[PDB]
């Protein structure tokens, strides 16, 4: 689902939609939410709702719009999961970061904005949150279980604003040696935080996942909220 009429123009002229939630009371900081591999779907709407309840506005851009506008896949449906994986494999990460940059600029100057912008991303969006943190586009970035973070550690010294990452200890994407590389690499830059949740794997913060873990979700989420709170007026 997207908010009808919302259109955001990217660097290269590509335009895309977004799901927007205006804040309960304005002005407010705006959080750009970077999707999982399933487009802008129920978990994205739930996350917009949550952040609005917590005193934010939120913008969730349609990052698959370069491939197919309006993708919103049910992660419990096998055939739709297959299409999600195909879209993820074809996904242009750099163009993703560019679209997020354009969403962040949009978020800065909406009527309801206090001018501060955060980013929270999950899975694919967690990977994108690290790349965005290296570019420095946002005031604060948060990633949940990005894939391949161990391959991006050359970017650690580029990070100039705070970023927070929540990783599942049982995430099959992240074997022990990768966790060690990430831990050591991140430790070099105190603007980065990474927490490991020993009893949780991928997708642990999404209730509809077979990998949902309520205790890990709740602790990660309260950490995210405490980390974003300084953006609030």
Report which secondary-structure segment, H or E, holds 104. Answer: helix 93-108
Q: Is residue 139 within 8 Å of 116, Cβ to Cβ?
A: yes
Question: 165 φ, ψ to 5°?
Answer: -130, 140
**SS3 label, residue 158:** helix
Question: For the packed helices 93-108 and 124-135, what is the interaxial angle rounded to 10 degrees?
Answer: 70
Which of the following is catalytic: 77, 171, 172, 195? 171
Which of the following is catalytic: 99, 139, 166, 202? 202
Chain Cα centroid distance, residue 12 = 22
Q: Is the dihedral of CA 207, 229, 122, 184 positive or negative?
A: negative
Cβ-based neighbours of 50, under 8 Å, separated by 6 or more? none
Q: Is 62 a catalytic residue?
A: no
Number of domains comprising the chain: 1
Region for residue 115 given its phi and psi (left: phi exceeds 0; alpha: psi -120 to 50; beta: otherwise) = left
Resolution of the coordinates, Å: 1.6
Report which secondary-structure segment, H or E, holds 198. Answer: none
Q: Is 171 a catalytic residue?
A: yes
Exposure b/e, 201-232, CB count within 10 A at least 16 = b = bbbbbbeebebebeebbeebbeebbebbeebe
Q: Is the dihedral of CA 52, 163, 103, 145 positive or negative?
A: negative
The Cα 50–Cα 55 span in angstroms is 9
Give DSSP secondary structure letters for 35-67: --TTBS-HHHHHHHHHHHHTT-EEEEE-GGGGT
Q: Which domain, by its residues, includes 36? A: 1-233
Beta partners for 196? 167
Q: What is the CATH number of the domain that holds 199?
A: 3.40.50.1820
């Amino acid at each position: 689902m997207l908010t009808e009429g919302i259109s955001i123009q990217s660097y290269d002229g590509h335009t895309f939609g977004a799901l927007v939630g205006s804040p309960a009371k304005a002005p407010a900081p705006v959080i750009v939410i970077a999707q999982e591999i399933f487009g802008v779907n129920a978990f994205m709407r739930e996350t917009v709702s949550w952040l609005v309840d917590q005193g934010y506005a939120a913008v969730c851009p349609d990052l698959y719009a370069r491939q197919a506008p309006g993708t919103a896949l049910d992660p419990q449906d096998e055939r739709q999961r297959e299409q999600a994986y195909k879209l993820w494999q074809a996904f242009d990460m750099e163009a993703g970061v560019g679209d997020l940059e354009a969403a962040i600029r949009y978020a800065r100057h909406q009527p309801y904005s206090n001018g501060k912008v955060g980013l929270v991303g999950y899975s694919l969006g967690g990977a994108l949150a690290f790349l965005v943190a290296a570019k420095g586009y946002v005031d604060r970035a948060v990633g949940y279980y990005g894939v391949g973070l161990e391959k991006q550690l050359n970017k650690v010294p580029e990070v100039k604003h705070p970023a927070l990452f929540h990783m599942g200890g049982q995430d099959h994407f992240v074997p022990a040696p990768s966790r060690q590389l990430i831990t050591e690499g991140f430790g070099a830059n105190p603007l980065l935080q990474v927490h490991w949740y020993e009893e949780a794997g991928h997708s642990f913060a999404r209730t509809s996942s077979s990998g949902y873990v309520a205790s890990a979700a709740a602790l990660a989420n309260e950490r995210t909220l405490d980390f974003l709170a300084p953006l609030q007026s």
